[PDB]
Amino acid sequence: RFKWGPASQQILFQAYERQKNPSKEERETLVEECNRAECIQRGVSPSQAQGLGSNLVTEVRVYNWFANRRKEEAFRH
Amino acid sequence: RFKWGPASQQILFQAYERQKNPSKEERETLVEECNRAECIQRGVSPSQAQGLGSNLVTEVRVYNWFANRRKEEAFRH
């Protein structure tokens, strides 16, 4: 289990179109920005970002989203 | 069943931030643009947009995505 929220996804798509290869440090910003945006939807305080539980955006998942979204431009057609 | 593809979602998020209240006619453009973009990921021809099956973006689903994404700005905090 673990799913991207529509709240974290518009953060993430907004980003890819300025840069689809986020650096080490960029990736870690998008993680803050995903957890918090996800918290303030759940009527959860940003400081209790661990309130999310399994749905906590680890930076590996931000990495893979970019990786995998780049795969989807590596196509046919 | 029926799910939004990451291909249809970046089409759809790209749109909301120019306009979150798409008109009758706009909605029907985003439907074309979602099915086709979804086809060309599946190594399916755009003309066989019915190849998709259940995952065919009806314009009601485009309507509801906008509706529901607007709900998510109607918050607390």
PDB file of C-alpha atoms in Angstrom, chain A residues 6-7 9-10 13-14 16-17 36 40-44 46 69 71-73 75-77, chain B residues 6-7 9-10 13-14 16-17 36 40-44 46 69 71-73 75-77:
ATOM      1  CA  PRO A   6      -3.848  14.179  -5.951  1.00  0.00           C
ATOM      2  CA  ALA A   7      -2.383  16.812  -3.622  1.00  0.00           C
ATOM      3  CA  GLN A   9       0.660  14.716  -7.670  1.00  0.00           C
ATOM      4  CA  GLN A  10      -0.014  18.286  -8.737  1.00  0.00           C
ATOM      5  CA  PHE A  13       3.724  17.279 -12.159  1.00  0.00           C
ATOM      6  CA  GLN A  14       4.213  21.107 -11.648  1.00  0.00           C
ATOM      7  CA  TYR A  16       8.671  17.831 -13.908  1.00  0.00           C
ATOM      8  CA  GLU A  17       7.963  20.487 -16.534  1.00  0.00           C
ATOM      9  CA  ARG A  36       3.064  18.839   4.140  1.00  0.00           C
ATOM     10  CA  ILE A  40      -2.904  19.937   5.323  1.00  0.00           C
ATOM     11  CA  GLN A  41      -5.479  17.913   3.353  1.00  0.00           C
ATOM     12  CA  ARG A  42      -5.854  15.400   6.157  1.00  0.00           C
ATOM     13  CA  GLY A  43      -6.573  18.107   8.825  1.00  0.00           C
ATOM     14  CA  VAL A  44      -3.259  17.003  10.177  1.00  0.00           C
ATOM     15  CA  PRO A  46       2.463  19.787   8.987  1.00  0.00           C
ATOM     16  CA  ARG A  69       7.604   9.343 -15.679  1.00  0.00           C
ATOM     17  CA  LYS A  71      10.258   6.047 -19.011  1.00  0.00           C
ATOM     18  CA  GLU A  72       6.832   7.044 -20.294  1.00  0.00           C
ATOM     19  CA  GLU A  73       8.378   9.516 -22.757  1.00  0.00           C
ATOM     20  CA  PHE A  75       8.216   5.313 -26.346  1.00  0.00           C
ATOM     21  CA  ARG A  76       7.241   3.979 -29.805  1.00  0.00           C
ATOM     22  CA  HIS A  77       5.003   5.734 -32.299  1.00  0.00           C
TER      23      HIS A  77
ATOM     24  CA  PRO B   6      -0.156   9.216 -15.554  1.00  0.00           C
ATOM     25  CA  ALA B   7      -0.356  10.151 -19.241  1.00  0.00           C
ATOM     26  CA  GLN B   9      -3.108  13.069 -15.505  1.00  0.00           C
ATOM     27  CA  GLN B  10      -0.349  15.383 -16.677  1.00  0.00           C
ATOM     28  CA  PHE B  13      -3.183  18.940 -14.226  1.00  0.00           C
ATOM     29  CA  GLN B  14      -1.548  21.106 -17.017  1.00  0.00           C
ATOM     30  CA  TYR B  16      -6.473  23.065 -14.257  1.00  0.00           C
ATOM     31  CA  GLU B  17      -3.866  25.768 -13.669  1.00  0.00           C
ATOM     32  CA  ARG B  36      -5.243   9.703 -27.604  1.00  0.00           C
ATOM     33  CA  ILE B  40      -0.094   6.295 -27.908  1.00  0.00           C
ATOM     34  CA  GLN B  41       1.261   4.877 -24.627  1.00  0.00           C
ATOM     35  CA  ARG B  42      -0.435   1.545 -25.207  1.00  0.00           C
ATOM     36  CA  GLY B  43       1.086   1.100 -28.737  1.00  0.00           C
ATOM     37  CA  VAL B  44      -2.476   1.505 -29.822  1.00  0.00           C
ATOM     38  CA  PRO B  46      -5.261   7.009 -31.786  1.00  0.00           C
ATOM     39  CA  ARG B  69      -9.977  18.655  -7.578  1.00  0.00           C
ATOM     40  CA  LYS B  71     -13.237  20.239  -3.594  1.00  0.00           C
ATOM     41  CA  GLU B  72      -9.660  19.669  -2.473  1.00  0.00           C
ATOM     42  CA  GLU B  73      -8.998  23.427  -2.381  1.00  0.00           C
ATOM     43  CA  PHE B  75     -10.451  23.073   2.941  1.00  0.00           C
ATOM     44  CA  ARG B  76      -9.679  23.834   6.619  1.00  0.00           C
ATOM     45  CA  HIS B  77      -6.375  25.089   7.968  1.00  0.00           C
TER      46      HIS B  77
END
